[PDB]
Paper text:
Tankyrase 1 and tankyrase 2 (TNKS1/2) are members of the PARP family of enzymes that control protein activities, interactions, and turnover through mono- or poly-ADP-ribosylation. TNKS1/2 regulate a number of target proteins, including AXIN1 and AXIN2 (AXIN1/2) in the β-catenin destruction complex resulting in WNT/β-catenin signaling pathway inhibition, and AMOT proteins in the Hippo signaling pathway resulting in YAP signaling inhibition. Tankyrases, through their ankyrin repeat clusters, bind to AXIN1/2, making AXIN1/2 accessible for ADP-ribosylation by the C-terminal TNKS1/2 catalytic domain. Several groups of chemical substances have been identified that inhibit TNKS1/2 by binding to the substrate NAD+ binding site either by occupying a nicotinamide pocket, adenosine binding pocket or by addressing both of them. Although the catalytic domains of 17 human ARTD/PARP enzymes are homologous, unique features in the TNKS1/2 catalytic domain allow the development of tankyrase-selective chemical inhibitors. We have previously developed tankyrase inhibitors bearing a 1,2,4-triazole moiety and binding predominantly to the adenosine binding site of the tankyrase catalytic domain.
As a consequence, in the following optimization campaign, the South 2-chlorophenyl moiety was replaced with the 2-fluorophenyl group of 23 resulting in acceptable efficacy compared to other substitutions. The comparison of the binding modes of the 2-halogen-substituted compounds showed that the chlorine or fluorine atoms were pointing into the same direction in the TNKS2 active site. This is in agreement with the clear difference in the measured potencies of the atropisomers. Next, all possible hybrid combinations were synthesized employing the East moieties of compounds 20 and 21, a South 2-fluorophenyl group, and three different West moieties revisiting the 2-pyridyl-4-methylsulfonyl moiety as well.9 From these six molecules, compounds with the 1,5-naphthyridine moiety (10, 11, and 12) showed approximately 30-fold improved cellular inhibitory efficacy compared to their counterparts with the 2-pyridyl moiety (13, 14, and 15, respectively). The binding mode of compound 13 in cocrystal structures was similar, and the hydrogen bonds to the backbone amides seen in the 1 cocrystal structures were retained. The large East moieties 1,5- and 1,6-naphthyridine (e.g., see 87, 88, 106, and 107Supplementary Figure 4a) appeared to form a more efficient π–π-stacking interaction with His1048 and a hydrophobic interaction with Phe1035, causing the side chain to gradually rotate according to the form of the East moiety. However, compounds with this naphthyridine moiety were less stable in microsomes relative to the corresponding East-pyridines, and consequently, 13 was short-listed for mouse pharmacokinetics studies. A water molecule forms bridging interactions between the pyridine nitrogen and Gly1058 and Tyr1050, and the same applies to all the cocrystal structures described.
Residue numbers in the entry: 952 to 1110, 1115 to 1161
Write the structure that this text describes.
């Protein structure tokens, strides 16, 4: 029972999500090996995802977390990348499909940097790239990120199967022998809602 509402490029709501995606782009340690080489996207479509079932199951979990974190949800708008976006918008985030070899264990990963989420769109480390050209830096094939409402609650700072005791999420941090950029991880699908579905291409520089 999911409905996509196509947003006009002249919508302030569109422009807000567009601005956030473009501005949160960073240079990457791997020289774009995983995500491709770019400093800007081609923003084709931004659609608002609408599902009462998935929305109600989010708000319900958000309430519980607030009561366990001094009446503060710790709600953040964050980008999500994965090969499973089409499923997520229909059946919601599902921890049961989490990759156990992840750096912070079997969780659903988010980022405050759109360019980081991009790296995971065609699998872990961009996998074998786009299906058509088998190219991680493909400027041709259309990509999809989710821009999600995420309840982080009491987030454990680090650098596993569920959140540490007393906590509701993990915030990964830049270590000289570790991460360059921030990660955010939940171990429960109901703690995130995919509010916006963004269709885009990475754009060739020069
Ligand atoms: C160092 C980088 O390591 C990472 C980065 C991101 C993630 C991650 N975060 N979230 C995901 C996906 C797997 C979750 N799947 C669903 O929520 C889901 C929901 C509904 N239906 C599905 C059907 C098939 C697969 N997944 C689903 C979301 N993934 C994910 C899981 C497996 C493979 C690639 C991924 F991006 N895991 C590890
Ligand atoms: Zn391609």
């Amino acid at each position: 029972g999911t409905i996509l509402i196509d947003l006009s490029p002249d919508d302030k709501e569109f422009q807000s999500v567009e601005e956030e995606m473009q501005s949160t782009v960073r240079e990457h340690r791997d020289g774009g090996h995983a995500g491709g080489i770019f400093n800007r996207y081609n923003i084709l479509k931004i659609q608002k995802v609408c599902n009462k079932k998935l929305w109600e199951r989010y708000t319900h979990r958000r309430k519980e977390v607030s009561e366990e974190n001094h009446n503060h949800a710790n709600e953040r708008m964050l980008f999500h990348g994965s090969p499973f976006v089409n499923a997520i918008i229909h059946k919601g985030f599902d921890e049961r499909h989490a990759y156990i070899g992840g750096m912070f264990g079997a969780g659903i990963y988010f980022a405050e940097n759109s360019s980081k989420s991009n790296q995971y769109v065609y699998g872990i480390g961009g996998g074998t790239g786009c299906p058509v050209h088998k190219d991680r830096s493909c400027y041709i094939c259309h990509r999809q990120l989710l821009f999600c409402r995420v309840t982080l609650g009491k987030s454990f700072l680090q650098f596993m199967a569920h959140s540490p005791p007393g906590h509701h999420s993990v915030t990964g941090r830049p270590s000289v022998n570790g991460l360059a950029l921030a990660e955010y991880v939940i171990y429960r699908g109901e703690q995130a809602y995919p509010e916006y579905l963004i269709t885009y291409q990475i754009m060739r520089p020069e």
